[PDB]
Amino acid sequence: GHMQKTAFIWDLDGTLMPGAREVLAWADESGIQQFIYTHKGNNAFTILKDLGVESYFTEILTSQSGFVRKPSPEAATYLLDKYQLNSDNTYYIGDRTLDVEFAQNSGIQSINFLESTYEGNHRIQALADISRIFETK
């Protein structure tokens, strides 16, 4: 509960997703702004519609976006000014070391299943640890 201006970011590469509709629903009512970025095309929107979860993400960037390759802080600096968000209160949801290289560059946080030696990266073991993070100081 409560939840300040906080933002969430997903991908469409493996991270409809048996276990995610929990966290999606929690985050949605919590007034977090979810987003996506992936290399996948304008079909991302259509797949999201198909699966019934399109509205669970404020904006879904795609190959259309044209933004730089990882590390690409460009794409997060967009996401901030889109709705006046805070990098330090945006929590990406990754699986990789690379999912923390760009995080550092942007000055944004990550919630990733492995440590990557960064003061903004939270280790986890399942998607349901996301809700715990905001529930234990």
**For the residues of 99-123, what is the DSSP string, one character each?**
HHHHHHHHT-EEEESS--S-TTEEE
CATH code (residue 89): 3.40.50.1000
Token pair in block for residue 7: 């933002």
| Number of CB atoms found within 10 A of residue 8's CB | 23
Token pair in block for residue 84: 């006046």
**Among 26, 35, 34, 53, residue whose Cα is nearest residue 133:** 26
Residue indicated by tokens 């201006």: 5
Experimental technique, in short, is: NMR
Q: How many structural domains comprise the chain?
A: 1
The answer for residues whose C-beta is within 8 angstroms of residue 37's C-beta and 6 or more apart is 9, 11, 60, 61, 65, 75
DSSP secondary structure letter of residue 2: -
Q: How far apart, in whole angstroms, are the C-alpha atoms of residue 76 and residue 67? A: 10
DSSP β-bridge partners for residue 91: 8, 109
Q: How far apart, in whole angstroms, are the C-alpha atoms of residue 36 and residue 55? A: 12
Instruction: Classify each residue of 33-42 as buried b or exposed e, where b means 16 or more C-beta atoms within 10 Å of its C-beta.
Output: bbbbbbebee
Beta 60-61 vs 121-123: how paired, if at all? unpaired
φ and ψ at 61, to 5 degrees? -75, 155
Residue indicated by tokens 């996948």: 40
Q: What is the span of the domain harbouring residue 18?
A: 1-137
∠5-91-45 over CA atoms, to 5°?
Answer: 90
Beta 90-94 vs 60-61: how paired, if at all? unpaired
